[PDB]
Design a protein around this ligand. Structure first.
Ligand SMILES: CC(C)(COP(=O)(O)OP(=O)(O)OC[C@H]1O[C@@H](n2cnc3c(N)ncnc32)[C@H](O)[C@@H]1OP(=O)(O)O)[C@@H](O)C(=O)NCCC(=O)NCCS
Ligand SMILES: [Zn+2]
Ligand SMILES: [Zn+2]
Ligand SMILES: [Zn+2]
Ligand SMILES: [Zn+2]
Length: 551
């Protein structure tokens, strides 16, 4: 509890800053009189009225015990006006102007009072899909229909359907049973209370995790007064178990950074966090065509691995790169034998120094190619596909100012990586899929490597059925999409035919969270672990690392 004069003296200047906005302030200076103002339904919408005078009064008369209560009322006033008035209206835009003045005023005042910040924070809104169509989606603030907070429909494709009954999966629900609502909900950030001074701070600002510091949160202010420091965070990236692969990659990266000798470079940590054996099954079209006649294996075994790179930024771990791979060993049947495929990779653009970021991503990929080559994998495979809009390959909720490359830029990026790999004599050469097939004198679809989740298994299903029994347009399909599909020769020619068994020295690593991309995306979504800002990514990394350490 601060002395009421202490609060008044500190906060009143922020309130005056709003008052002295003419004419913007005027609509907010006195309690809304619904009838006088010619608006009867105001209290049907606004259930907790608030205005400057009411706030001034509570402030003058010591009704606030702590400054966030003042901030909450200010924001209640603003949201009341944004709620009742149209986006295009006068009062709405006035309100917006006041809120901007307020945000700028309030932040340094709150910090003067011993707080992390004075900002009002809320999480990004989740994207709502549609059960009506494959990748239909609902837009923020626009109206939609939902059932059991589970089945949602865009206002268009909801009214599309003839009649008054919807079908969810095989049971039938009257339209009247759906909720009509706007996608305008934003969840506030959480606070944690200093156990000594009692100040409430943003959990993400102070990075307090209950598992890491179970004794409780104590702010930096209180710690410094008694010359204390937080107990060490033992749930770090560095303390995750090492592997031969992780070590090899991180040595390559850090040796590169040391050669560059750029100011303010940090050490990179690379960890393999999952390794398990899986199988890809041939889909029904291709299986009817070639498996049932014994021309192709019904399935192919591979090892999947997930790996991540971390850097320390402002004293804290930051996960900035992630990748999953499929590795088809020497025991695997043709056509997949001794091949690696990149399932997906992703990044969060906070790496320092910026001007070595791309270089470092390339070093990770070149190192990985070099490593599997050494094990006796002959060939790498890359599908250059950027994420579609609003999908994330690995990291939930990217920074809005992280641009997503289009296909031509992404293709060139892989080419630049591979060209460096060739000049280092790691990659022998590489070709697009069409040229490679030509060189291999390929004649049938059963000869194409068959990877989990890849383009070619799906397009082959489509092709066989379109042609009513089918390979017919295979060269044409390859030519058409060729720029997107890289085939990378690690071990060339006669040497590729007489190799010893592939023996991976690294053990299996059971981690369900990292068995493919879905589980970590789901976790992140369910726990508001975004990678959309430096501070949120630092929080999300901290939580990810606790999860990886605790199993
Ligand atoms: C693939 C990836 C690691 C490469 O990123 P990168 O090497 O750091 O740099 P990019 O390819 O993003 O692009 C480089 C520059 O183009 C800009 N840029 C990227 N796309 C752009 C676009 N479409 N329009 C305008 N500018 C663009 C970036 O802002 C960057 O500018 P800068 O010189 O200030 O750094 C990263 O783009 C990523 O994680 N992307 C999303 C996932 C993805 O595309 N995965 C592919 C799966 S195969
Ligand atoms: Zn804060
Ligand atoms: Zn729809
Ligand atoms: Zn404190
Ligand atoms: Zn530089």
């Amino acid at each position: 509890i601060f002395k009421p004069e202490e609060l008044r003296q500190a906060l009143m200047p922020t309130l005056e800053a709003l008052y002295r906005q003419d004419p913007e302030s005027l609509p907010f200076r006195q309690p809304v009189d619904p009838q006088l103002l010619g608006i009867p339904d105001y209290f049907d919408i606004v259930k907790s009225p608030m205005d400057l005078s009411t706030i001034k009064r509570k402030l003058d008369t010591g009704q606030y015990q702590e400054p966030w209560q003042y901030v909450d009322d200010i924001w209640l006033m603003f949201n009341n006006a944004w709620l009742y008035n149209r986006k295009t209206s006068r009062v709405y835009k006035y309100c917006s102007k006041l809120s901007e003045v307020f945000e700028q005023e309030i932040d340094p005042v709150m910090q003067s009072l011993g707080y992390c910040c004075g900002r009002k924070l809320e999480f990004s809104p989740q994207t709502l899909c549609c059960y009506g169509k494959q990748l239909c989606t609902i837009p923020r603030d626009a109206t939609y229909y939902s059932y059991q907070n589970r089945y949602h429909f865009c206002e268009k494709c909801f009214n599309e359907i003839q009649g008054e009954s919807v079908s969810l999966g095989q049971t039938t629900i009257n339209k009247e049973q759906f909720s009509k609502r706007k996608n305008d909900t934003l969840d506030p950030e959480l606070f944690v209370e200093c156990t000594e001074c009692g100040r409430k701070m943003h959990q993400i600002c102070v990075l307090h995790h209950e598992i890491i510091w179970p004794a409780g949160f104590v702010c930096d202010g209180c710690l410094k007064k008694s010359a204390r420091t937080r107990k060490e965070n033992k749930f770090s990236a560095k303390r995750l178990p090492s592997t031969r692969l992780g070590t090899f990659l991180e040595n390559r990266v850090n040796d590169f950074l040391r050669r560059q000798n750029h100011p303010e470079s940090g050490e990179v940590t690379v960890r393999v966090v999952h390794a398990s054996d899986k199988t890809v099954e041939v889909k029904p079209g291709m299986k009817a065509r070639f498996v049932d006649s014994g021309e192709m294996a019904e399935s192919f075994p591979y090892r999947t691995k997930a790996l991540f790179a971390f850097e320390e930024i402002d004293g804290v771990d930051l996960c900035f790169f992630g990748m999953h791979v499929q590795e088809y060993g020497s025991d695997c049947p043709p056509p997949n034998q001794r091949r690696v495929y990149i399932s997906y990779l992703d990044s969060v653009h906070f790496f320092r120094p910026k001007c070595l970021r791309t270089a470092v991503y390339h070093e990770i990929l070149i190192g990985y190619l070099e490593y599997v080559k050494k094990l006796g994998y002959t060939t790498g495979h890359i599908w250059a596909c950027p994420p579609s809009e609003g999908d994330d390959y690995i990291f939930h909720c990217h920074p809005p100012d992280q641009k997503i490359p289009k296909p031509k830029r992404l293709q060139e990026w892989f080419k630049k990586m591979l060209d460096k790999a060739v000049s280092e004599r790691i990659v022998h050469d590489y070709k697009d899929i069409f040229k490679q097939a030509t060189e291999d004198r390929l004649t049938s679809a059963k000869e194409l490597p068959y990877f989990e989740g890849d383009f070619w298994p799906n397009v082959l299903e489509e092709s066989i059925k379109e042609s009513g029994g089918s390979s017919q347009k295979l060269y044409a399909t390859m030519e058409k999409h060729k720029e997107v599909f890289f085939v990378i020769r690690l071990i060339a020619g006669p040497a590729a035919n007489s190799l010893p068994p592939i023996v991976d020295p690294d053990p299996l690593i059971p981690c369900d969270l990292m068995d493919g991309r879905d589980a970590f995306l789901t976790l992140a979504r369910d726990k508001h672990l975004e990678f959309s800002s430096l501070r949120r990514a630092q929080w999300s990394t901290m939580c990810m690392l606790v999860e990886l350490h605790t199993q």
